[PDB]
Design a protein around this ligand. Structure first.
Ligand SMILES: *[C@@H]1O[C@H](CO)[C@@H](O[C@@H]2O[C@H](CO)[C@@H](O)[C@H](O)[C@H]2NC(C)=O)[C@H](O)[C@H]1NC(C)=O
Ligand SMILES: *[C@@H]1O[C@H](CO)[C@@H](O[C@@H]2O[C@H](CO)[C@@H](O)[C@H](O)[C@H]2NC(C)=O)[C@H](O)[C@H]1NC(C)=O
Ligand SMILES: *[C@@H]1O[C@H](CO)[C@@H](O[C@@H]2O[C@H](CO)[C@@H](O)[C@H](O)[C@H]2NC(C)=O)[C@H](O)[C@H]1NC(C)=O
Ligand SMILES: *[C@@H]1O[C@H](CO)[C@@H](O[C@@H]2O[C@H](CO)[C@@H](O)[C@H](O)[C@H]2NC(C)=O)[C@H](O)[C@H]1NC(C)=O
Ligand SMILES: *[C@@H]1O[C@H](CO)[C@@H](O[C@@H]2O[C@H](CO)[C@@H](O)[C@H](O)[C@H]2NC(C)=O)[C@H](O)[C@H]1NC(C)=O
Ligand SMILES: *[C@@H]1O[C@H](CO)[C@@H](O[C@@H]2O[C@H](CO)[C@@H](O)[C@H](O)[C@H]2NC(C)=O)[C@H](O)[C@H]1NC(C)=O
Ligand SMILES: *[C@@H]1O[C@H](CO)[C@@H](O[C@@H]2O[C@H](CO)[C@@H](O)[C@H](O)[C@H]2NC(C)=O)[C@H](O)[C@H]1NC(C)=O
Ligand SMILES: *[C@@H]1O[C@H](CO)[C@@H](O[C@@H]2O[C@H](CO)[C@@H](O)[C@H](O)[C@H]2NC(C)=O)[C@H](O)[C@H]1NC(C)=O
Ligand SMILES: *[C@@H]1O[C@H](CO)[C@@H](O[C@@H]2O[C@H](CO)[C@@H](O)[C@H](O)[C@H]2NC(C)=O)[C@H](O)[C@H]1NC(C)=O
Ligand SMILES: CC(=O)N[C@@H]1[C@@H](O)[C@H](O)[C@@H](CO)O[C@H]1O
Ligand SMILES: CC(=O)N[C@@H]1[C@@H](O)[C@H](O)[C@@H](CO)O[C@H]1O
Ligand SMILES: CC(=O)N[C@@H]1[C@@H](O)[C@H](O)[C@@H](CO)O[C@H]1O
Ligand SMILES: *[C@@H]1O[C@H](CO)[C@@H](O)[C@H](O)[C@H]1NC(C)=O
Ligand SMILES: *[C@@H]1O[C@H](CO)[C@@H](O)[C@H](O)[C@H]1NC(C)=O
Ligand SMILES: *[C@@H]1O[C@H](CO)[C@@H](O)[C@H](O)[C@H]1NC(C)=O
Ligand SMILES: *[C@@H]1O[C@H](CO)[C@@H](O)[C@H](O)[C@H]1NC(C)=O
Ligand SMILES: *[C@@H]1O[C@H](CO)[C@@H](O)[C@H](O)[C@H]1NC(C)=O
Ligand SMILES: *[C@@H]1O[C@H](CO)[C@@H](O)[C@H](O)[C@H]1NC(C)=O
Lengths: 342, 169, 169, 342, 169, 342
């Protein structure tokens, strides 16, 4: 009589990849993959989330807040996670900007980069004592107030000069200003208007040259006089003119230099920001909570260790991306049932 | 596998051994008996479970956005950053593929080792009167029907039940 | 290897066993006989072939030029792109080195397992009259010259040809 | 009598690296490496190849084609593979350019980057109605025609102003123009000449300032009046002058801005290009077919899975680069022949 | 491990076997004797030493600064360069973690293979009069006190010292 | 009687990570990790080290040497290893620079990048024959000499024009100059002074515009006239003025272009540098020898194959960084001592 060792034969539909034996059929398998499905973005668990530079700044754009518009001056805090919902962010009012002429649109998205950011604990450059003559701190309707006065971006001053005379380039020296080793984001620009209004406001009706230097980053502009493009991301009809606006990043301890003439939207309140936040292209009416924020798939939570599908930037407790679905053998190589015995 | 093929083991599916992956067969007048070993299996399941746990520990840096690189101004940096993301994702994917394959080559191969262990458990409890073939099989001096065979799978077998010598611990 | 060294196997080259990598030796009045096993080998060759096939599947992203980075304008990006190319190439090279080494450690080690299997094939066909040393060797109750030994390598051996007991399937 | 298991002893010159047993000698080996040998470039199999922005544009440079010269206006299509044979590409005629003053040389090599590129289905900016006064669309010998008239880069217009008077900087606004979400590559520049010819052609003999803005990318120039360097990559003797030429990349939906004065080679026909092509430094009289194009080794075909040698960018069905030649054990660890038996 | 557990080996710490990691126990009137094998150990130590040497060969490109990327001008490139440094360091760290773990899984598992070899060394020298249990143990026809057991660990044992048959090479 | 195989039981405090058996306790272990400890920087063995662009240039800054100041003209050689001790390097004398307005500070740190660098085997641009009228090669106290004459940066010429008259932008064409395929680093700038001294020195008291082009890299400046910031990294009181200074990198075979007016610190002696050196943020009074220079830990020598701790750039024979301390099992899985026998 014969007693022997043996293994089973059973349904073995699952196939597993091995080194010595090529691809083999197996009794059972533990999957390690999943193809997640597109869902809405949530709030990463152990970290705080941003998708609106500011929550207590109400009905506004992030660019609006960035630029320092009147109402949109809600004091904005810290998250260590930030979603980027505005790839090309817009303004929702105030003075008409000719945006597409500077890197300015991304100011919010640069800000987003930081963990901490602040309106500003002061305002560099004394708009009145500014090089050039005395200026009236130009104010403007088209940018309401807490009371409906004359709004102009807490960011910057509308340097309209008493003694309207033409100017050879003048040089402001924008200082560091910031608490600790924060980064500083200076903002500034220039108003330009038509033939007539130019002479009326400042003593010159010719194209005005502007030039900034900051950490070896030179930029040079030339104002436009006539035929400005239609007004947009603004409100109500000071359409004689437009402000070309730009930002300047001053690293810790460093000084900026703006060469300017007439229309000079001098800087004022200047961002101080520091800390690094993990950012991701999100698309957000932010609903609820996930373990992991995938640029595609969105709010997602960690079931299996790897995931199959679309690779993309992703932050949090995320499954690792994988070329192909992978399975762990949980069983026995297929054997055909036996009667090859005697 | 390679061991069993060479050393005349049976590439035998024994459908019907259901409570387990490995156990014993039994052969004679009564026909053929089949039993699974509910230890060699739990053992095989334990190994795999712990392997799953090990495959699951691997951590890999998040992979996010460049905080200082701007979407319309720095597209050439942003491109190089994509390339970096892609290559990372490819490199670690390949590694994980390699880890798991090794895992599967082990798990699958471990198989014949269970068989080989199961056989030593048998050699003992059958007693010294039995005859070890090399097969993975033992010629016994007594009959072994299903009840006999089940006492083996339990480890409640005693040679002497059919008056034959015994090893005792 | 470590197994054979410990458990008194012979680090024996048997030149002359040519049709194969592993088989049997045979010892006595006739001197020494040598035979190779044309299955343990095909088996060893199969494993390796499949391992080659597995080592050959690995795919890795092409690694090209930055389409937006210009040769004289963006040299600092272009440098960082070189570094990326270099590091990728180094990382995957190291991984492949690790995959293959594991492959070789397996292949080389598998060796003693064949020997160990070959021996169980022998134990069966020699019959119960033989004596298993532990060596990897069997003391037999009959002579085994080259013809005998060749019938073993084939699996056409029968104890009883020299009237001695047999296991039959 | 003793029957035993045994292994062979045989010629074992090949050495293999193992983990537990250090480096060991082996019966045989399967090599997985090769050092390929330098060969000519070919046409990647499953994808189409470019090494001349245009094939039906005859005897020309790629830069020539890029710039929109008269004859070299062959309608150029798509490849998903492109070789870069011109690191510093040249022009082969037309109006003398002072190339080394702008990024322009690489225009072709930027174009190459795309799968699809097109001459242009229109020409932005009405050269006549252009800001400033009426211009004669300056034409010029030194750039033949289909008939030998006056050639000037389909790319751009030679804005020579009737009413030769000096100008304060004027601002063109180069629009998007392109089909779908293609990229746009605007091209433009400025002619300058000598004291006398400057006054003759436009009403001013002084250095002329030029300034472009595009996607936050500012560039500013100042024309040269006297002593231009020797003429080259041109033809035949309008050597009173030279054109400084440059390009501007407009991403989908975006607007460009060129501030200018006199000599303004206004843009005209503007590239629309999209799709991404895999590019590689190739050196080409392209001969035949390979599996894989190595920046060094060149046209190469996949024998073994890995290759030893010079790492380099490479595209197609390529062997993976490897530090050192690798071999797969196909056999047995060396054993010395035996008579250590008794 | 899984082999020993299944095939009734003893998860036996034998404190007191000190000169080595593995050897023999011995059992009877005299009580229990313990001996270590000063070869199975040197062997186990050799494997590990060579594994250390192999783990130590791995070379990986230095990882330095971008020579053309300037600290205040090119911070967005410099950032992407950090990311590259970080990801490299993470990728190769993970790989090394995987290499070593495999190394440890092998080393730890090799264990039962030594035991299994040690047993074949025993089977031979005990002679054919002994009885192989399957246990890892042999029932002998003679007593084996500490002196006996020590001659086994040396390989200076002879069945016949207690007049019993012998295998001779 | 029973003879059996057995394994030991012994002190097993060390724990090792395994795949099939989770984390297990082991007899002994070979550590492969260490947490190195912060030490001083040394001289990498097989390669030569730099931490002072020049050793035979005595009491000076690296920027001083870079800029070509009088005493600090020690002929500086080659290392294939260079430490970066000055993140924001300073000057230690000579004419007061308004540093923070250009990328100039990093000139030394760019130079450091190369294996070979040289003062210059000539001086491009004939300061006298320079476009514009004849200039007196302005010299200046505030920059001593080998004898105490008038020092001005061997780098560049202080172009003070005889015939003090106002100028429309003039264009120098800075040639290649260098031996072989070295890189060239041109240097240059502009002096500016006060109302009065401006008119005295050159014939104009207005802001002066400057514009360079080099390998598609445009930069534009506008000189400051009044109220310069306090003088620093200088010496002794020519505090009427300051020089804004900048560099220009000319790749092999390539030409530079500087558009300029008045104050033009024309280039003179121009760096030729080539070879690539491995650089690292070091902090150095360089003491002795190490195997490996870690940006943190500093001078360090290779004991074990991997190290735990702070990742950082590191060069030389370095241990590979690792997430967690790793140990190699050198022994046996823990077994409890036995009397579970009968
Ligand atoms: C082993 O596995 C394969 C697939 O994992 C089984 O054959 C497959 O049948 C399924 C049924 O839907 C198909 O999806 C697959 O396409 C088939 N195989 C392939 C990939 O060609 C096979 O039947 C399984 N069992 C055995 C006995 O081999
Ligand atoms: C992913 O995981 C989390 C589990 O925390 C889910 O979020 C919770 O959703 C449940 C719904 O049953 C709510 O009751 C909880 O309020 C949520 N978080 C907790 C614990 O307070 C999330 O919905 C899961 N699914 C996905 C795809 O995001
Ligand atoms: C691996 O496969 C085995 C079955 O072969 C799974 O184990 C069964 O698991 C259930 C729980 O789902 C237990 O109650 C039983 O004891 C097991 N045997 C049965 C139901 O026949 C096991 O869960 C699988 N996965 C893992 C983690 O190994
Ligand atoms: C094992 O391999 C080595 C080399 O793979 C053999 O010795 C080599 O002899 C060749 C003959 O040309 C030389 O190229 C090598 O330099 C020698 N070894 C080295 C690297 O020093 C050796 O003879 C082979 N066989 C045995 C029996 O060990
Ligand atoms: C690499 O592989 C290809 C094989 O497709 C070779 O290209 C072929 O060359 C043969 C020469 O015998 C010609 O007959 C064919 O016309 C070519 N392609 C086909 C199949 O039409 C190529 O020459 C090989 N060698 C290298 C190094 O490129
Ligand atoms: C591995 O080595 C073996 C020889 O040891 C090779 O197999 C021989 O291959 C030839 C074909 O080249 C066959 O006709 C024979 O049956 C084999 N034995 C001989 C000739 O003695 C094998 O090809 C090698 N490579 C692989 C892929 O394993
Ligand atoms: C096995 O190892 C662990 C730790 O490696 C031992 O228990 C540890 O006791 C030490 C004593 O200082 C502590 O540092 C650890 O915190 C304890 N374990 C942990 C991590 O919780 C254990 O005693 C060792 N031996 C045995 C018999 O398991
Ligand atoms: C790291 O290694 C080197 C060994 O070369 C040490 O440098 C030597 O220090 C010894 C001190 O005993 C001096 O005698 C030698 O002059 C030095 N180099 C030689 C060989 O000439 C170094 O100190 C070690 N320690 C660290 C952390 O750097
Ligand atoms: C691994 O552990 C063993 C001990 O289990 C170490 O070997 C001992 O090493 C000393 C030298 O330190 C030798 O003199 C002895 O022969 C060994 N046995 C003892 C002292 O009992 C070994 O060095 C450890 N490390 C390695 C590299 O394996
Ligand atoms: C540059 C400047 O200070 N602005 C002018 C100044 O030039 C002028 O003399 C004065 C006349 O009142 O008005 C003011
Ligand atoms: C700027 C412009 O439009 N160009 C001139 C204009 O200023 C001038 O008055 C006119 C005289 O005919 O010629 C034209
Ligand atoms: C530009 C130039 O050459 N500089 C001036 C020139 O214009 C002037 O006519 C001359 C008078 O002597 O002085 C010099
Ligand atoms: C709004 O505008 C008026 C004048 O324009 C200003 O004086 C007032 O302070 C503003 N509202 C606030 C801040 O109360
Ligand atoms: C096995 O045989 C025994 C008697 O020797 C008997 O009691 C038992 O019923 C048998 N089992 C079966 C189910 O055949
Ligand atoms: C082996 O012995 C048998 C007889 O027992 C004989 O027929 C045969 O020739 C022998 N083989 C050789 C070659 O020695
Ligand atoms: C060539 O030039 C003439 C005038 O310069 C132009 O009218 C003609 O259209 C051109 N040739 C073509 C396009 O037929
Ligand atoms: C083992 O027994 C032998 C006699 O058979 C005796 O010489 C020896 O002393 C014994 N060893 C011990 C220590 O018990
Ligand atoms: C130092 O200065 C004087 C004039 O300023 C100059 O002539 C002399 O050559 C300089 N010293 C040297 C180089 O001997």
């Amino acid at each position: 009589d014969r007693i022997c060792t043996g293994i089973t034969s059973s349904n073995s539909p699952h196939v597993v990849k091995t080194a010595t034996q090529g691809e083999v059929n197996v009794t059972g398998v533990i999957p390690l993959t999943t193809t997640p499905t597109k869902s809405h973005f949530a709030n990463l668990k152990g970290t705080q989330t941003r998708g609106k530079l500011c929550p207590n700044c109400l009905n506004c754009t992030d660019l609006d807040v960035a630029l320092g518009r009147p109402k949109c001056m809600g004091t904005i805090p810290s998250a260590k996670a930030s979603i980027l919902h505005e790839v090309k962010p817009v303004t929702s009012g105030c003075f008409p900007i000719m945006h597409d002429r500077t890197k300015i649109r991304q100011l919010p998205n640069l800000l987003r980069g930081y963990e901490n950011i602040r309106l500003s604990a002061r305002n560099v450059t004394n708009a009145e004592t500014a090089p050039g003559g005395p200026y009236i701190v130009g104010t403007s309707g088209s940018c309401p107030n807490v009371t409906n006065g004359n709004g102009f971006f807490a960011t910057m001053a509308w340097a309209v000069p008493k003694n309207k005379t033409a100017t050879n380039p003048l040089t402001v020296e924008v200082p560091y200003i910031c608490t600790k080793g924060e980064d500083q984001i200076t903002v500034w620009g220039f108003h330009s208007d038509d033939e007539t209004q130019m002479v009326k406001l400042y003593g010159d009706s010719k194209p005005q040259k502007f030039t900034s230097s900051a950490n070896g980053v030179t930029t040079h502009y030339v104002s436009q006089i006539g035929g400005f493009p239609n007004q947009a991301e603004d409100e109500g009809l000071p359409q004689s003119g437009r402000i070309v606006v730009d930002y300047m990043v001053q690293k810790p301890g460093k000084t900026g230099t703006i060469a300017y003439q007439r229309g000079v939207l001098l800087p004022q309140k200047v961002w101080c920001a520091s800390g690094r936040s993990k950012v991701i292209k999100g698309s957000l009416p932010l609903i609820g909570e996930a373990d992991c924020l995938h640029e595609k798939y969105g709010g997602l939570n960690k079931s299996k260790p790897y995931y199959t599908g679309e690779h993309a930037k992703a932050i949090g407790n995320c499954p690792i991306w994988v070329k192909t679905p992978l399975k762990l053998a949980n069983g026995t190589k297929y054997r055909p049932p036996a009667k090859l015995l005697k | 596998g390679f061991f069993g093929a060479i050393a005349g083991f049976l590439e035998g599916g024994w459908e019907g051994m259901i409570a387990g992956w490995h156990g014993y067969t039994s052969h004679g007048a009564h026909g053929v008996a089949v039993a699974a070993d509910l230890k060699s299996t739990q053992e095989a399941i334990n190994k795999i479970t712990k392997n799953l746990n090990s495959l699951s520990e691997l951590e890999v840096k998040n992979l996010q956005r460049l905080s200082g690189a701007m979407d319309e101004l720095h597209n050439e940096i942003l491109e190089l950053d994509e390339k970096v993301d892609d290559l990372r994702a490819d490199t670690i994917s390949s590694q994980i593929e390699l880890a798991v394959l090794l895992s599967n080559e082990g798990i699958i191969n471990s198989e014949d080792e269970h068989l080989l262990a199961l056989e030593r458990k048998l050699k003992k409890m059958l007693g010294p009167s039995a005859v070890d073939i090399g097969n993975g099989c033992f010629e016994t001096k007594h009959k072994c029907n299903q009840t006999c065979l089940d006492r083996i799978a339990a480890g409640t077998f005693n040679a002497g039940e059919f008056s034959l010598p015994t090893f005792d611990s």
